[PDB]
Amino acid sequence: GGNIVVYWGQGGSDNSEGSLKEACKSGHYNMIVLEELITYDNGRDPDLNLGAHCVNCTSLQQEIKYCQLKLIKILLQIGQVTPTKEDTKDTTKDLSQYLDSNFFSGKSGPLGEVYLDGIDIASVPEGLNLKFDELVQALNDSATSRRIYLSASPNCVYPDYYLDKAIQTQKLDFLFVQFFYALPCIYTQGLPEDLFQAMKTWTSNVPESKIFMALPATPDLNGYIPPRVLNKEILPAVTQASNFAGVMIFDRYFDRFRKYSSKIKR
Amino acid sequence: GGNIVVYWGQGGSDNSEGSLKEACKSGHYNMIVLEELITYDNGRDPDLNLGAHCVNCTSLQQEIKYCQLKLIKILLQIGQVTPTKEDTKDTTKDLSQYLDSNFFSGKSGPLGEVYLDGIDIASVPEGLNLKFDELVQALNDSATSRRIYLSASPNCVYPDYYLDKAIQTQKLDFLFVQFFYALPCIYTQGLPEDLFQAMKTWTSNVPESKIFMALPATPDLNGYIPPRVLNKEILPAVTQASNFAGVMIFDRYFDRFRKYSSKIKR
Numbered sequence: 001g002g003n004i005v006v007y008w009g010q011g012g013s014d015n016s017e018g019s020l021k022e023a024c025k026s027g028h029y030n031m032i033v034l035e036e037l038i039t040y041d042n043g044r045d046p047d048l049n050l051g052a053h054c055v056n057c058t059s060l061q062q063e064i065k066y067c068q069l070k071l072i073k074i075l076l077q078i079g080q081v082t083p084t085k086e087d088t089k090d091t092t093k094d095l096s097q098y099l100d101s102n103f104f105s106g107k108s109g110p111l112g113e114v115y116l117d118g119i120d121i122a123s124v125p126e127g128l129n130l131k132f133d134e135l136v137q138a139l140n141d142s143a144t145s146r147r148i149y150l151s152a153s154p155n156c157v158y159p160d161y162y163l164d165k166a167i168q169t170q171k172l173d174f175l176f177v178q179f180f181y182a183l184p185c186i187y188t189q190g191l192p193e194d195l196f197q198a199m200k201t202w203t204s205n206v207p208e209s210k211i212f213m214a215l216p217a218t219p220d221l222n223g224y225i226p227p228r229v230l231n232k233e234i235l236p237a238v239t240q241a242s243n244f245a246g247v248m249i250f251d252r253y254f255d256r257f258r259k260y261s262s263k264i265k266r
Numbered sequence: 267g268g269n270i271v272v273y274w275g276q277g278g279s280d281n282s283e284g285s286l287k288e289a290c291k292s293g294h295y296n297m298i299v300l301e302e303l304i305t306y307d308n309g310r311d312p313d314l315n316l317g318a319h320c321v322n323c324t325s326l327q328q329e330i331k332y333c334q335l336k337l338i339k340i341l342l343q344i345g346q347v348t349p350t351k352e353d354t355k356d357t358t359k360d361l362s363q364y365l366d367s368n369f370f371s372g373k374s375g376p377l378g379e380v381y382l383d384g385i386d387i388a389s390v391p392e393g394l395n396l397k398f399d400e401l402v403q404a405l406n407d408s409a410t411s412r413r414i415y416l417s418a419s420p421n422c423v424y425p426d427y428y429l430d431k432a433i434q435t436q437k438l439d440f441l442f443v444q445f446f447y448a449l450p451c452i453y454t455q456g457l458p459e460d461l462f463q464a465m466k467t468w469t470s471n472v473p474e475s476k477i478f479m480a481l482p483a484t485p486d487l488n489g490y491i492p493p494r495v496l497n498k499e500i501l502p503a504v505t506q507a508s509n510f511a512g513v514m515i516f517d518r519y520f521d522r523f524r525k526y527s528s529k530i531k532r
């Protein structure tokens with residue numbers, strides 16, 4: 001089956017996009033990125049935002065652990081940095097510490113008593129105080145024997161305006177390169193040329209990281225690659241890169257109904 | 267000040283984008299569109315999704331009423347239709363009835379004991395059972411003496427693939443035409459030509475509805491129009507349309523920090 005990852009958490013409620021456990025139990029995925037954590041440039045404690053899934057999300061603990069015991073990695077995505085004009089000391093250091101204590105220590109945090117597998121950073125502005133490359137270095141330097149995987153979700157334009165610094169730390173394990181919404185590098189009908197060139201650029205410029213092609217599971221989004229096109233044209237070309245890792249599915253909501261991941265070649 | 271509307275509800279928590287009351291109290295807006303209600307093609311009761319603002323959102327009642335007593339209209343946006351392959355009878359009729367009972371009757375619904383001012387529909391796929399134009403007609407035909415405003419948020423491409431049928435009912439009071447993210451009709455630096463042509467097309471083809479230009483409040487989104495450009499170039503041209511209504515701000519989160527609406531001409 002290879003490496004198929006998926007985004008979950010912003011697809012509504014359990015009744016719209018299914019529970020996290022449902023996603024894991026489906027067997028389609030070996031890694032889930034939870035969307036998303038809101039962080040504060042002024043050092044306020046982060047706010048978890050899993051939409052209509054839960055407000056008290058501590059009961060997700062058992063679902064996270066179920067996933068992990070099925071060998072599925074669970075990463076939490078930082079999706080929003082609330083800016084401040086205030087000059088505040090130690091914001092990045094303090095966030096790294098908050099994350100370590102609340103998600104990577106088995107202690108009672110927002111997702112219950114878990115050790116998550118890592119942190120993803122979305123392609124969004126950082127703060128005047130909070131800096132993503134600094135955060136990545138701090139997390140990798142964490143006082144723990146646990147493996148904390150670090151990743152980013154850049155758009156397919158290289159370099160990514162928001163994440164290039166974090167990428168150039170050379171400390172990201174995975175990149176979920178987004179080939180959806182309107183960008184010059186998406187697939188369009190009968191035209192993979194820009195996507196191929198972007199994949200060449202990403203894989204060659206970030207040889208230290210595993211590169212996922214993040215694709216939409218629905219034909220209602222720009223960048224959609226029909227499964228036969230993905231299997232017979234796209235994958236044969238992009239898999240020539242030694243650091244091509246697989247496909248990231250945007251997102252569990254669309255995939256739950258479309259069963260796009262089911263149609264990807266073995 | 268004219269007509270300035272804003273989207274609120276998907277900007278995170280109260281600490282990231284402020285409470286609904288805060289938005290109303292700011293005095294920047296005369297209409298707020300709440301994002302968003304999830305509806306079900308199989309006829310399941312809708313799920314309210316105001317992200318990390320609340321799960322039990324009934325306590326928003328007092329904030330809604332505060333807004334309304336300040337002459338601010340509150341509309342709820344349908345943002346997501348969860349599809350089904352099942353053929354289910356009366357889905358649209360039943361949704362109209364659910365909305366009437368739960369948001370337009372002063373009874374104890376998901377937002378408490380309110381009479382909302384109306385419903386907006388996002389530019390998203392409808393269902394195999396649930397149909398937007400049918401929903402608009404049903405809501406307008408509601409057994410009530412209350413005014414229910416009906417609107418849609420089409421993208422700037424005319425016709426809108428998802429909402430054109432709803433628009434052609436001629437029963438929409440407002441259109442929030444979205445000139446952001448990547449589309450051929452957005453403003454780009456020193457180039458309003460496509461936006462002007464789109465505004466001509468929207469205003470001339472939908473003379474029966476008031477047309478808002480929906481614009482991003484942050485320079486970090488495609489389509490951003492610096493306030494001086496908006497005031498001295500854009501508004502003088504587009505305001506020549508008799509049905510040009512004003513500016514819809516995407517969104518309260520960005521506007522809270524950027525104070526974009528504050529910079530729009532009187």
Ligand SMILES: *[C@@H]1O[C@H](CO)[C@@H](O[C@@H]2O[C@H](CO)[C@@H](O)[C@H](O)[C@H]2NC(C)=O)[C@H](O)[C@H]1NC(C)=O
Binds near residue numbers: 140142144146148
């Ligand atoms: C920081 O990154 C380094 C390098 O990827 C990680 O170090 C590896 O850790 C694994 C398991 O602990 C070992 O098998 C490797 O031999 C290590 N490699 C090197 C070069 O030291 C380290 O674990 C990361 N830190 C965290 C907190 O995950």
Ligand SMILES: *[C@@H]1O[C@H](CO)[C@@H](O[C@@H]2O[C@H](CO)[C@@H](O)[C@H](O)[C@H]2NC(C)=O)[C@H](O)[C@H]1NC(C)=O
Binds near residue numbers: 405
């Ligand atoms: C359906 O649309 C019609 C037309 O806009 C609305 O009828 C208007 O109602 C207002 C206030 O009740 C009156 O001042 C107008 O004279 C009416 N116009 C016409 C042509 O009848 C009607 O209110 C809408 N239905 C709902 C539930 O809002």
Ligand SMILES: CC(=O)N[C@@H]1[C@@H](O)[C@H](O)[C@@H](CO)O[C@H]1O
Binds near residue numbers: 065068069106113114
């Ligand atoms: C495979 C896996 O990740 N197992 C985790 C374990 O590491 C952790 O000690 C525990 C308590 O938080 O949750 C487990 O089930």
Ligand SMILES: CC(=O)N[C@@H]1[C@@H](O)[C@H](O)[C@@H](CO)O[C@H]1O
Binds near residue numbers: 083124125126162
């Ligand atoms: C607060 C903010 O917007 N910071 C941005 C940062 O996100 C971006 O990666 C960088 C690129 O050089 O430019 C900064 O201005």
Ligand SMILES: CC(=O)N[C@@H]1[C@@H](O)[C@H](O)[C@@H](CO)O[C@H]1O
Binds near residue numbers: 334
């Ligand atoms: C101006 C306004 O909309 N006022 C509303 C009123 O119509 C409604 O009867 C009441 C109870 O639900 O909430 C009010 O304050």
Ligand SMILES: CC(=O)N[C@@H]1[C@@H](O)[C@H](O)[C@@H](CO)O[C@H]1O
Binds near residue numbers: 349
């Ligand atoms: C379930 C679904 O996707 N329905 C779409 C509808 O949203 C769209 O407005 C219409 C345009 O003709 O095409 C239908 O296939």
Ligand code: NA
Binds near residue numbers: 218220221254391
């Ligand atoms: Na879709």
Ligand code: NA
Binds near residue numbers: 125487520
């Ligand atoms: Na921004």
